From a paper:
The R120Q mutation is located close to the N-terminal end of the α3 helix. Due to the mutation, residue 120 loses contact with the α6-α7 loop tip at Cys240, whereby the hydrogen bond between the Arg120 side chain and the backbone carbonyl of Cys240 is lost. This is further linked to alterations in surrounding side chain conformations. Arg120 participates in a hydrogen bond network between helices α3 and α6. Arg120 in GDAP1 is a target of several CMT mutations, and its interactions with the backbone carbonyl of Cys240 in the ⍺6-⍺7 loop appear central. Structures of the mutants R120Q and R120W indicate loosening of the structure locally, as well as loss of the hydrogen bond, which is accompanied by a decrease in observed heat stability in R120Q and R120W. Arg120 is not conserved in GSTs at the sequence level; however, an Arg residue from the neighbouring helix in GST reaches the same position and makes similar interactions to the same carbonyl group in the ⍺6-⍺7 loop. In essence, all substitutions to Arg120 are unfavourable; this shows that the interactions made by Arg120 are important for folding and stability. This is in line with our experimental data for both R120Q and R120W, which indicate minor changes in structure, but destabilisation of the fold. Also R120Q had a slightly different conformation, most clearly seen in the distance distribution.
The ganglioside-induced differentiation-associated protein 1 (GDAP1) is an integral MOM protein, proposed to have an auxiliary role in mitochondrial fission and fusion, possibly via redox-dependent interactions with cytoskeletal components. GDAP1 has two GST-like domains, followed by a transmembrane helix, which anchors the protein into the MOM. Structural data have shown a covalently bound dimer interface in GDAP1, and while dimerisation is a common feature in catalytic GSTs, the GDAP1 dimer is formed differently, with a unique interface having a central disulphide bridge between Cys88 from each subunit. We carried out structural and biophysical analyses on several CMT-linked GDAP1 protein variants and describe new crystal structures of the autosomal recessive R120Q and the autosomal dominant A247V and R282H GDAP1 variants.
Numbering used by the authors:
A (entry chain A), B (entry chain A): 23 to 165, 197 to 302
The structure:
């Protein structure tokens, strides 16, 4: 009876993780996309999301939670009905710290800096989905927050190190799993918060053109298979199916 | 036409400052007291507000702001119509840094620790408005977050140092102002955010019984006069008139 209310930007990275957790836990929520199709500067969503997509908020009766991570933790702590799926093993579980490891590993990536650099240095991307004139608009507003190419190759190399860990664990998952069985996700048989972080963060790289550089075409094949699997997951397609199409707003 | 929506706890200290700023700036807002009269443990509001009153949230079209200070700053930055009163002098004003000084000075006081200590050590209070059995309930839930008396006399002495600065500035204000004229507030003729912090924070001390110790009865007479003035201010009485009566909820 107590309502579950959420305010957010449909295309905000933070919002996407939260909205996917709600769908995974089969929770009834009253979502409110406060984002508008056209900005004051007459701009669409794919022209604005740098730091302008900031922090959502969740309202559950007497509780008010804001940031993405803090909202997800609240949902996991609160809705404990037997019918509600758990996205984290028990707190005292043998397998718990491994899940929280990959979760914090992915949640620490500077996604705003990756978005900041894509629009500013397209040459480092492949098949970017942002129009090229976005690089023309943001750079005309000029006359670590700056456009140091070395700084991007640095964190992009840092990203490859993180994905090397993921490819390894997925490889570990692949060998342990018999074929014709139920293929596991990142940490185990079940879909966890680490998977929520992975699905959403890999989908953002595909939007920014940082996908061909990191997986596919022979590189990190287990990561490619993982990403092609979440795309078909029904909870992921319903909540994030169109968040990369620049034709919907 | 764009609506102004707020979620909060009526008795939360943070919420009170925000709601007083809205009233001072004559802003039309859609306030939503999410606090309930009776807790899950069958408790009223005056039994719960330690850290359970946490952070409000403001929703203005595409913007989502959370903490109290950040909300107040947003309101000051946004609503600039000539008819909207300003609670801060211009950013490049000669008198600006003095206002921001007293504001940050008051906003840094550990109000949650003062509330925490009152219920835990009534002996250090005078005319506390919390029922005495609140000390009986919270201490029965046991079997810096702890109940070190020296730690409270420490920060209470720190509080007196802050109020000594306020009494001095109000004294300075008194001497400069001719009698029969318009009596000024803390920083000047106009009601500022520093006054919003002062009015709400002094009203909380009166609720916790830390008023007789700090002003009145001959002590800090300018502070006593200030507090008796805000009580009659129509914007203050409409928004905070009943927030100390334990009979309303």
């Amino acid at each position: 009876e107590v309502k579950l209310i959420l305010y957010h930007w449909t295309h905000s990275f933070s919002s996407q993780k939260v909205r996917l957790v709600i769908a995974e836990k089969a929770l009834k929520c009253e979502e409110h996309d406060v984002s508008l199709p056209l900005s004051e500067h007459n701009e669409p969503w794919f022209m604005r999301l740098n730091s302008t997509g900031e922090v959502p908020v969740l309202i559950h009766g007497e509780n008010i939670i804001c940031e993405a991570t803090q909202i997800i933790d609240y949902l996991e702590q609160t809705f404990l009905d037997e019918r509600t799926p758990r996205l984290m093993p028990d707190k005292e579980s043998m397998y718990y710290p491994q899940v929280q490891h990959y979760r914090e590993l992915l949640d620490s990536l500077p996604m705003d800096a990756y978005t900041h650099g894509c629009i500013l240095h397209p040459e480092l991307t492949v098949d970017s989905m942002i129009p090229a004139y976005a690089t023309t608009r943001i750079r005309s507003q000029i006359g670590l927050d700056h456009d140091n190419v070395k700084y991007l190759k640095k964190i992009l190399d840092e990203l490859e190190k993180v994905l090397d860990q993921v490819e390894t664990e997925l490889q570990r998952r692949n060998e342990e799993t018999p074929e014709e069985g139920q293929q596991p996700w990142l940490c185990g048989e079940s879909f966890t918060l680490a998977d929520v972080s992975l699905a959403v963060t890999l989908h953002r790289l595909k939007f920014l053109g940082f996908a061909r550089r990191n997986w596919g075409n022979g590189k990190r094949p287990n990561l490619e298979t993982y990403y092609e699997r979440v795309l078909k997951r029904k909870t992921f397609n319903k909540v994030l199916g169109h968040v990369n199409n620049i034709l919907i707003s």
